[PDB]
Amino acid sequence: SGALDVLQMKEEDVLKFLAAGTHLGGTNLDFQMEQYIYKRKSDGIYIINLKRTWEKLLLAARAIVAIENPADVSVISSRNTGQRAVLKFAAATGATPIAGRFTPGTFTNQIQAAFREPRLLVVTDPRADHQPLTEASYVNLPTIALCNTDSPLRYVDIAIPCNNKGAHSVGLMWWMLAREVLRMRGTISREHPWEVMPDLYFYRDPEE
Amino acid sequence: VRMNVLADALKSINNAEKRGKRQVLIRPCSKVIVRFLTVMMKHGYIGEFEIIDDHRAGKIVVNLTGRLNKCGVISPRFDVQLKDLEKWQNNLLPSRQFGFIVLTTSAGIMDHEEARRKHTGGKILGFFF
Amino acid sequence: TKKRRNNGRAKKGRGHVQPIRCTNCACCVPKDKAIKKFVIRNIVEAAAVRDISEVSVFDAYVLPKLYVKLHYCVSCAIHSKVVRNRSREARKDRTPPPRFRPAGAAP
């Protein structure tokens, strides 16, 4: 609980999550992530704590509200699985974007044409998106992040444990964030469900 | 092997605080370690500590805040003559104003301020600030 | 200034090992140091087997190999490009590689 009730778990969600196979977690734990871990499945794989994955995601959402100018929260992904994902998040919430080749000197370096002064970064893979995570730590900007069980914890305050091996796990978690932030300081009202199908987040890809 | 036990406890602490740690387990403890941990405590440089009783020599858990830049030990335990205390605090304290030299005198393990007030002296244990 | 943390080639836990003799200079180098390359090849070779298969009796048969484990001292293995100076960075890679397994249609 906390903030007081409704805000707790909802089977409906624990259903979307298990469905999207988030909790599945990496075989290599990593030490700073040990808390997330619920249990280790036989035949090596770890079960993330969805309850924990849930609450942190809400904690993330709340930090995204409280930024006044929504545009200046930067959602970021160079990973494909998270590219339409972040583009969607930016469409709904204010949130400006940074997909693909991050481009170095974007936070440091006025002169540049992708120069951004976010007040909050949200990253999807701390290993793939290491540049943005490093640049951010050159200029006092907080970081939400996509972390599987074995992701870099350096310079990331707030993790939301995922699966990020991929599928819809990256889709759902960006979805749920936007869903959550629109609820808070937004205007969804009635932490009731979605007119938006979560598939709308989710990776595209190729063609024959 | 071991010559002193204090020096280990103090170092262990210093590395805890340097890491960003908020607790430590020192081993093995002694009356002198307690007394020193205690002088530190009175002054704020650590939180509360706890002597756990293995059937051996003891183990202490210190909960530390982060007001501690450094707690050192002086070896050997040189004799000090009331106007060598003035010389010591200057050698090893940040400003005249604060930080303590803690020594052992006939009338107790004490910080040098308490020493000056009692008007006794002795052999130097260590310090902090 | 020390170049390879491994010094020569891997010892660490010894101080001694018997030396081998280079298969070229007939030099002398500790066995821990020394480039070693296995060498397995058919008795016959490329072109031969066809006359070797036709001229033989036996219904197939099916070719022996000569096996020889070579040793070179540093200067020979360099000289003959068994191994080649690698940049201050590339030297650190123990690994091994190429892209197909050159066995007939390679270089």
Add this chain to the structure above:
Amino acid sequence: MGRVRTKTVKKAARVIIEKYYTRLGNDFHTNKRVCEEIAIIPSKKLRNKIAGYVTHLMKRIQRGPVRGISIKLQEEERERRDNYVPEVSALDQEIIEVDPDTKEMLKLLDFGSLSNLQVTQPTVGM
């Protein structure tokens, strides 16, 4: 080869195409006239060399989007294409097949669900 277009040329081609796509064409002869209208180019040989490379581009663009060029019309086309979604693919068909433990994942998650068991064998590293 011996004729490798230089940046001053190649740039102008990217340039015009970005602000000129629906105006420009397939054919050298006409863009060349167009470069007179839409740009101020100092020598005739340059303007020709420009018209020519930008046409080589238009010929290519009109056969597949080209690595660094964007025009309003191409954006609209990608936009429409980037809608697709069927009967939909998961289903997944009656009943999820689980690997169990993933069965024990739901079982100890307070969650009903469809079912199936086939999850056994270890399990080598490398």
Add this chain to the structure above:
Amino acid sequence: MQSNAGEFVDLYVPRKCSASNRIIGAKDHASIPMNVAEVDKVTGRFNGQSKTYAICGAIRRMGESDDSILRLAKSHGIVSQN
């Protein structure tokens, strides 16, 4: 930083980490805090009214800022059974 007559001198009093109680000093721009929204209870309705934490360059470079937030957020809510 009092002076003679209880006056407050030098020029500023720095903020202190939310995890280590250690001065953020002053040019270490590899450090930042994190304003969490208060909620008008019940739920949603971001209402101000920040609940805020500041984390030091050190903790963050050591691959904490996150957890520290959680000890911070739960201990003072929200966040429970973390």
Add this chain to the structure above:
Amino acid sequence: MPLAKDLLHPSPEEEKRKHKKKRLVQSPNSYFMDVKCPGCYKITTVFSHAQTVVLCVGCSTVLCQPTGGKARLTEGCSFRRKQH
């Protein structure tokens, strides 16, 4: 080591994984048992790791042989721990 443990109350599971000498306050990781062999009805107490042959009260029997560690109890035998 992320600036998070309660050195004073550590978990029983990760206390139980640690070396006998590394335990918060030390303690052993060895135990005693009562052992059966139907023919007799009385029961010999035995130490988990043992070095000595241990023989039963009367019958020249066996009752484990020693090893690097825990004594290997012998075939058809039974054993309750066990106390405090």
Add this chain to the structure above:
RNA sequence: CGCAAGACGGACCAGAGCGAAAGCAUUUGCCAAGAAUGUUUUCAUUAAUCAAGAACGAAAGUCGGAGGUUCGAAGACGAUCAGAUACCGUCGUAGUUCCGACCAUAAACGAUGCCGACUGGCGAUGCGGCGGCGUUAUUCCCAUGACCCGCCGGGCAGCUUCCGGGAAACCAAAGUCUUUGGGUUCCGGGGGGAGUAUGGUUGCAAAGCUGAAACUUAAAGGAAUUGACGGAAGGGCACCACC
């Protein structure tokens, strides 16, 4: 094809083992010995590190035998070169090998004293113990056994890391050093003269240990950076290069 002699233990063989270090790979037996582990065994401070003293100590050399297969410090030869006493070929020496004595030195390098604590991630591997309603191998079930996975010690190491160190190269120790203080031992104070003179000592000898000065001289030296340049490696480009 057989046999003799003397030599040596290939492939298997590793950033793998053991040993204080020097060093140590055939089988098998005997002889004592050494670490790790396990251990609710035993003692109650037994202990850390060390002038003096002492054990061991690759190679060559030296003393006397055995022995000399192999190869070969010297020599004599054939070539090469302007010169070649060399490299290169050949003949071939003491010697290599072994036994009993000497000798006490090797970039005897991890060029890194030894002992204790503390500070950081991951996966290997030798080894011990521990745990699994995991695999495979069997009999009627086994006791087996080898593995997979995890845990814990203590090995040699590796890998990645703005903790921190350092002049850097680098370094999880070379960290915890101006915020300079855990124990102890040793050596150095610009470079040459010099490991030289001289006395002592040890040595059969060859030599070893201890070890100056006069005089000489303003850099000796380290590390990184960059060119230039190479009979170093991949590179190219041109009939001022070849084809």
